[PDB]
Specification:
This is part of a larger assembly, with one copy of chain A (148 residues), three copies of chain B (269 residues) and two copies of chain C (48 residues). Chain B is mostly helical and 269 residues long. Chain B is built from twelve helices and no strands. The chains are: A alpha+beta (148), B mainly alpha (269), C mainly alpha (48). It is classed as virus.
Chain lengths: 148, 269, 48, 48, 269, 269
């Protein structure tokens, strides 16, 4: 995400603080430094997909919640108002198009925003391939059991 | 227009300016401004005050109730925000969590019902939960909210509204610096708006009742003084100024009493 | 809820609960006497 | 002065006084002669 | 500063008082005050009328268009209240409860951009909704929102605003007794404010078109009457007073003719 | 009541005017402007002039020092903001902020010399930190780093503080634009406030040392000229005017020299 931004004058130290991780006293530097392009892996659909989600979310939940409040849901309507107007406190001033939407447009918005999720299904979960039961001395190898 | 009586053009211009800038000046009460009444009193003493000031103060109270009824703002705009806050925050918090105060949610549903006086009764008891969430291990605190200068300025604003119902200003207590939580600031909003709404309606009904009681009293005294004469103009003035007056009636009656001022200036001796 | 005052103050403060729109809840005994001689023993009675 | 269990006709009281009359026009079911439509809360002490 | 020293100073004072109290007197139109045009008339009979009346009425209509463009009030203050009522009341009407008029809210915004015939259609489609809410079953009746006495008064107020768009009064529709609800009174407010806004704008465009038509007519007659002479003063007066005008060039042209007033009053034969 | 020697009412009014409005002018150095001593000299050459005006300058410098020590504003109010910046931001950057920042070195550079610190090396180290957070490597700008749109104005503010340390204003950090955020604006505020604190204290100590040096200088020239005569009023004036003074003892001595101006006006030769 932050490799695409320019004009941060702390960009080198902030990439360095991202690349240095530590876990049980073994450091490693994540080799995706300044975009050397050796194998950056470039992850461009992954960041694009995340930001499509975080941009198409508020207006989709807005167009759903602005409808059928007469029924006693009683929890969802209150929660969305709170969650939306805390972060996006000044909600929809200029409005872009001033509430001229198509039902087909809303259809395409929800269909797209749900395609993005089930296609970022890969970075969604991480399965446990092995559950290690014991580890040999000096941490050379370990006997595990196999799952998934 | 602007019929009043045998008063001077100076006094008619004074009453014009007063009933125009009624919404402008503060402490709107005809008892609190006695200069209107001694502008209303008639030149050359009580020999012509003894009937004409009865008629003229009758005209003052009629047009005062008229300009109140014509210039009341609509406080349902602030009760709409009361319904939004009381609905969205209170019921839904006590349903979403802490499912013991549903008896108090039935109480706040009856508070949503238009029983404001009994509703604002036990605003202490529905403030105690806001005290519990603003400060841990719940104590009793003063009834107005957490910030001290905002607490004093709320009371200053409520006294301003109680003096002048016609011109009122909301306080809009919300803050971006929030040591106090969001939901309990919404509770603070609800308490302030509920007090503002009930204060405006109490003071409005108070001055309306006072004006109508003064109108009925001046009718009784003025009919008692007009009783003795049996000329046709005098008994027609009796039958006009004897007609019953309610608040929905007073505006049509002011039109009637203009078209009868055309006679009852000359009908009075 | 019960409330007691002195008869000096109540003769001058009598019409307050009629000027206000407060509605007094049902007493237990007036809730009880509206039921019938057989409906009283049924579990729908809120006063068994 | 509606003070007792008896002696408390709403049809008499709301025709002397206007404040009972608008109290009964908004809550018509307290116009009943049968039970106790509410006395002033210093006067309506039913168990006592 | 202030031409026509050669008229009577009484008549110059008449024109000064007219242009100073144009926003105060009613029926703001130069056509409706023919004694202004009859006080414009030039001495020594028709022989001097035949030249100087065209220049005199020319500067009259130029000053009239100038004081209009200088003294036009702002209408975005009342359109602010229209936008506020349309946004708040309609969204809390529909999205908060019983959402049926999604397409109608689409309509209200798409028409609020820049359409007036559609504002008449919205007046229809909101009178329908007000008759739904005020008496709770749908039926149609034409042009009546509520309150026949205020309905008679609103026609008087709209005639006042149409005659004097410079000096207009907002009526404050609302009722102190609550025989119809807050939302019905808000629809009453929105219908009255929309009719008021389109009345002010169309009366303004009417006056501006009339003023420009009079100025172009006086240019044609004045150039056709000054066509005869071949003096240098005459042809310089032609080349000054022959130039075309817009609504935003009239101020510079008034400044230029004020600066060269001496050579054209010498050019007058 | 305002004790001074044989002067004119205009000179007494001008001295009282200056010592009253000492706060509002710039450049409070009584040495630097010479306009006062020409009022403090009485008249008539040197003959009736040395011994009277020496006492007069004694009273002038003494009451100047009095009104300084009475109208000094507190700088501990800005040192409280220095501790608010120093404690809450920077230590939390190095402890609760993570990533280097040796606790011992940085915390002791903060914590040592709580009172009477004039260290520029601490500011240089914090400039090295803030400049590493910023864009460019060298230390050309000791305050705002990365911009100079306010640098000449903060120079002007520190010079105006040097001129009138009795009346000082803290400038401000422009909130919408900043290169880094809360951190670099806190560091720039800490540098500017530490410089303002040490500048105002050094200017105050400079002026107080000046006033005490001038008073101790004039006591000797007063005493050597009063030493010769042997009258009792003379030797009592010698003892009163040879009482030793400190800047913390000067206020009671001003009261004493009023109550003895009752006598020593006549004691002079």
């Amino acid at each position: 995400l932050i490799a695409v931004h320019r004009e941060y004058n702390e960009m080198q130290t902030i990439i360095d603080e991202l690349c240095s991780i530590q876990y049980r006293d073994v450091l490693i530097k994540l080799p995706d430094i300044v975009n050397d392009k050796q194998s950056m892996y470039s992850m461009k659909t992954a960041c694009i997909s995340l930001s499509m989600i975080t941009a198409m979310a508020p207006d989709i939940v807005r167009t759903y919640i602005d409808r059928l409040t007469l029924e006693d849901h009683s929890m969802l309507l209150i929660k969305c108002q709170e969650l939306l107007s805390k972060r996006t406190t000044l909600s929809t001033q200029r409005c872009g198009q001033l509430h001229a939407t198509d039902i087909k447009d809303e259809l395409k918005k929800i269909k797209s925003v749900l395609t993005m999720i089930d296609q970022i299904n890969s970075l969604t979960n991480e399965k446990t391939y092995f559950v290690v039961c014991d580890v040999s001395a000096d941490n050379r190898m370990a006997t595990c059991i196999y799952k998934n | 227009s602007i019929p009043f009586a045998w008063l001077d053009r100076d006094k008619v211009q004074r009453l014009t300016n007063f009933l125009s800038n009624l919404e402008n000046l503060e402490n709107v009460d005809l008892r609190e401004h006695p200069y209107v009444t001694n502008s209303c009193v008639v030149r050359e003493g009580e020999d012509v005050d003894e009937l004409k000031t009865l008629y003229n103060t009758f005209i003052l109270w009629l047009m005062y109730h008229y300009v109140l009824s014509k210039r009341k703002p609509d406080y349902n705009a602030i009760w709409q925000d009361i319904t939004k806050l009381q609905n969205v925050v209170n019921e839904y918090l006590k349903s979403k969590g802490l499912n013991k105060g549903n008896f108090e949610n039935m109480f706040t549903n009856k508070e949503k019902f238009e029983s404001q006086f009994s509703d604002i009764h036990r605003a202490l008891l529905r403030l105690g939960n806001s005290i519990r969430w603003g400060s841990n291990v719940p104590i009793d605190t003063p009834y107005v909210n957490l910030t001290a200068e905002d607490s004093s300025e709320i009371e200053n604003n409520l006294q301003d509204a109680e003096k002048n119902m016609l011109w009122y200003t909301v306080y809009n207590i919300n803050d971006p610096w929030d040591e106090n939580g969001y939901l309990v600031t919404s509770i603070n909003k609800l308490v302030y708006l509920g007090k503002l709404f009930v204060t405006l309606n109490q003071s409005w009904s108070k001055l309306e009742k006072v004006a109508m009681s003064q109108i009925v009293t001046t009718q009784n005294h003025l009919s008692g003084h007009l009783r003795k004469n049996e000329n046709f103009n005098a008994v027609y003035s009796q039958r006009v100024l004897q007609t019953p007056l309610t608040g929905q009636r007073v505006e049509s009656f002011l039109k009637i009493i203009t078209s009868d001022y055309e006679i009852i200036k000359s009908s009075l001796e | 809820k019960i409330t007691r005052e002195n008869p000096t103050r109540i003769l001058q403060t009598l019409y307050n609960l009629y000027e206000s729109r407060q509605e007094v809840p049902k007493n237990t005994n007036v809730l009880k006497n509206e039921l019938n001689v057989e409906d009283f023993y049924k579990p729908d009675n809120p006063t068994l | 002065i509606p003070f007792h269990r008896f002696f408390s006709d709403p049809g008499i009281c709301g025709t002397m006084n206007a404040d009972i009359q608008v109290f009964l026009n908004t809550f018509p079911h307290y116009q009943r002669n049968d039970g106790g439509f509410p006395l002033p809360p210093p006067l309506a002490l039913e168990f006592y």
